[PDB]
Design a protein around this motif. Sequence first.
Motif, PDB file in Angstrom:
ATOM      1  N   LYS A   9     -39.220  10.270 -72.697  1.00  8.32           N
ATOM      2  CA  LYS A   9     -38.617  11.569 -72.438  1.00  8.32           C
ATOM      3  C   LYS A   9     -38.816  12.494 -73.631  1.00  8.32           C
ATOM      4  N   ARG A  10     -39.205  13.734 -73.344  1.00  9.14           N
ATOM      5  CA  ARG A  10     -39.411  14.731 -74.384  1.00  9.14           C
ATOM      6  C   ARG A  10     -38.079  15.346 -74.793  1.00  9.14           C
ATOM      7  N   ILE A  11     -37.784  15.301 -76.089  1.00  6.92           N
ATOM      8  CA  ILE A  11     -36.559  15.861 -76.650  1.00  6.92           C
ATOM      9  C   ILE A  11     -36.969  16.948 -77.632  1.00  6.92           C
ATOM     10  N   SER A  12     -36.725  18.205 -77.269  1.00  2.00           N
ATOM     11  CA  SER A  12     -37.129  19.325 -78.104  1.00  2.00           C
ATOM     12  C   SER A  12     -36.202  20.505 -77.860  1.00  2.00           C
ATOM     13  N   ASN A  13     -36.102  21.371 -78.869  1.00 10.34           N
ATOM     14  CA  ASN A  13     -35.293  22.590 -78.814  1.00 10.34           C
ATOM     15  C   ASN A  13     -33.833  22.264 -78.494  1.00 10.34           C
ATOM     16  N   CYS A  14     -33.235  21.448 -79.359  1.00 11.00           N
ATOM     17  CA  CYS A  14     -31.847  21.040 -79.197  1.00 11.00           C
ATOM     18  C   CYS A  14     -31.362  20.432 -80.505  1.00 11.00           C
ATOM     19  N   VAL A  15     -30.043  20.302 -80.617  1.00  9.21           N
ATOM     20  CA  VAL A  15     -29.402  19.702 -81.780  1.00  9.21           C
ATOM     21  C   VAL A  15     -29.032  18.269 -81.428  1.00  9.21           C
ATOM     22  N   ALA A  16     -29.523  17.319 -82.219  1.00 10.34           N
ATOM     23  CA  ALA A  16     -29.303  15.898 -81.978  1.00 10.34           C
ATOM     24  C   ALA A  16     -28.270  15.382 -82.974  1.00 10.34           C
ATOM     25  N   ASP A  17     -27.119  14.954 -82.461  1.00 14.41           N
ATOM     26  CA  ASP A  17     -26.043  14.403 -83.282  1.00 14.41           C
ATOM     27  C   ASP A  17     -26.095  12.884 -83.161  1.00 14.41           C
ATOM     28  N   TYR A  18     -26.616  12.227 -84.196  1.00 15.35           N
ATOM     29  CA  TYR A  18     -26.766  10.779 -84.198  1.00 15.35           C
ATOM     30  C   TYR A  18     -25.528  10.047 -84.696  1.00 15.35           C
ATOM     31  N   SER A  19     -24.521  10.766 -85.196  1.00 16.93           N
ATOM     32  CA  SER A  19     -23.314  10.106 -85.683  1.00 16.93           C
ATOM     33  C   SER A  19     -22.534   9.450 -84.552  1.00 16.93           C
ATOM     34  N   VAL A  20     -22.527  10.064 -83.367  1.00 16.04           N
ATOM     35  CA  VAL A  20     -21.806   9.487 -82.238  1.00 16.04           C
ATOM     36  C   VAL A  20     -22.462   8.186 -81.794  1.00 16.04           C
ATOM     37  N   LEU A  21     -23.796   8.142 -81.799  1.00 16.71           N
ATOM     38  CA  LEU A  21     -24.495   6.923 -81.408  1.00 16.71           C
ATOM     39  C   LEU A  21     -24.341   5.826 -82.453  1.00 16.71           C
ATOM     40  N   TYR A  22     -24.171   6.198 -83.723  1.00 21.14           N
ATOM     41  CA  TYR A  22     -24.014   5.199 -84.773  1.00 21.14           C
ATOM     42  C   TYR A  22     -22.593   4.650 -84.821  1.00 21.14           C
ATOM     43  N   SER A  26     -20.519  -0.179 -79.113  1.00 18.03           N
ATOM     44  CA  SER A  26     -21.009  -0.799 -77.886  1.00 18.03           C
ATOM     45  C   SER A  26     -22.434  -1.312 -78.043  1.00 18.03           C
ATOM     46  N   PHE A  27     -23.213  -0.715 -78.941  1.00 21.41           N
ATOM     47  CA  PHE A  27     -24.590  -1.136 -79.155  1.00 21.41           C
ATOM     48  C   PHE A  27     -24.621  -2.435 -79.951  1.00 21.41           C
ATOM     49  N   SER A  28     -25.324  -3.434 -79.421  1.00 17.19           N
ATOM     50  CA  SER A  28     -25.404  -4.738 -80.067  1.00 17.19           C
ATOM     51  C   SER A  28     -26.505  -4.815 -81.113  1.00 17.19           C
ATOM     52  N   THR A  29     -27.562  -4.017 -80.971  1.00 13.04           N
ATOM     53  CA  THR A  29     -28.686  -4.025 -81.903  1.00 13.04           C
ATOM     54  C   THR A  29     -29.049  -2.586 -82.238  1.00 13.04           C
ATOM     55  N   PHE A  30     -28.783  -2.180 -83.481  1.00 17.62           N
ATOM     56  CA  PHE A  30     -29.105  -0.835 -83.968  1.00 17.62           C
ATOM     57  C   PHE A  30     -29.674  -0.995 -85.376  1.00 17.62           C
ATOM     58  N   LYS A  31     -30.996  -1.124 -85.463  1.00 17.13           N
ATOM     59  CA  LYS A  31     -31.684  -1.334 -86.731  1.00 17.13           C
ATOM     60  C   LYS A  31     -32.826  -0.337 -86.846  1.00 17.13           C
ATOM     61  N   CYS A  32     -32.836   0.426 -87.934  1.00 15.33           N
ATOM     62  CA  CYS A  32     -33.909   1.367 -88.209  1.00 15.33           C
ATOM     63  C   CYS A  32     -34.958   0.721 -89.108  1.00 15.33           C
ATOM     64  N   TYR A  33     -36.123   1.362 -89.181  1.00  8.32           N
ATOM     65  CA  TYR A  33     -37.238   0.837 -89.961  1.00  8.32           C
ATOM     66  C   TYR A  33     -37.901   1.853 -90.878  1.00  8.32           C
ATOM     67  N   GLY A  34     -37.758   3.150 -90.626  1.00  7.30           N
ATOM     68  CA  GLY A  34     -38.367   4.148 -91.482  1.00  7.30           C
ATOM     69  C   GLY A  34     -37.366   4.900 -92.334  1.00  7.30           C
ATOM     70  N   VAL A  35     -36.191   5.174 -91.773  1.00  7.12           N
ATOM     71  CA  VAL A  35     -35.133   5.908 -92.447  1.00  7.12           C
ATOM     72  C   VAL A  35     -33.827   5.137 -92.286  1.00  7.12           C
ATOM     73  N   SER A  36     -32.746   5.718 -92.806  1.00  5.05           N
ATOM     74  CA  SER A  36     -31.419   5.147 -92.662  1.00  5.05           C
ATOM     75  C   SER A  36     -30.605   5.943 -91.647  1.00  5.05           C
ATOM     76  N   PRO A  37     -29.723   5.282 -90.893  1.00  5.91           N
ATOM     77  CA  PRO A  37     -28.930   6.007 -89.888  1.00  5.91           C
ATOM     78  C   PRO A  37     -27.931   6.983 -90.483  1.00  5.91           C
TER      79      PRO A  37
END
Lengths: 50, 49
Positions: A9-22, A26-37
């Motif tokens: 899915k294309r995600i563009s022209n919007c504000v993405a708030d990743y704090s709610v997802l972090y 409920s998420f059992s696996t949340f691991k990043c590889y390039g940056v930090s959450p």
Amino acid sequence: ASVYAWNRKRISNCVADYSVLYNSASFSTFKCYGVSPTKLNDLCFTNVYA
Amino acid sequence: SALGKLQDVVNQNAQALNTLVKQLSSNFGAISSVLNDILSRLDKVEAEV
């Protein structure tokens, strides 16, 4: 969709708030590889694809 | 070419600084060459590496 027919899915022209997802336990696996959450809320993104 | 002995000294003194400035842009195995780019994407334990 299936794994062999995964949809992107294309995600563009919007504000993405990743704090709610972090902060959601409920998420059992949340691991990043390039940056930090923690630094996701203070950085822009050129192209976002999920 | 009369002052070549001085021109070579000047060229070497400039090329040393140019090479230093260029090597400043090296990655040395890191994820990025800019310090602020690493200090603003990874956590402390991962940024120190």
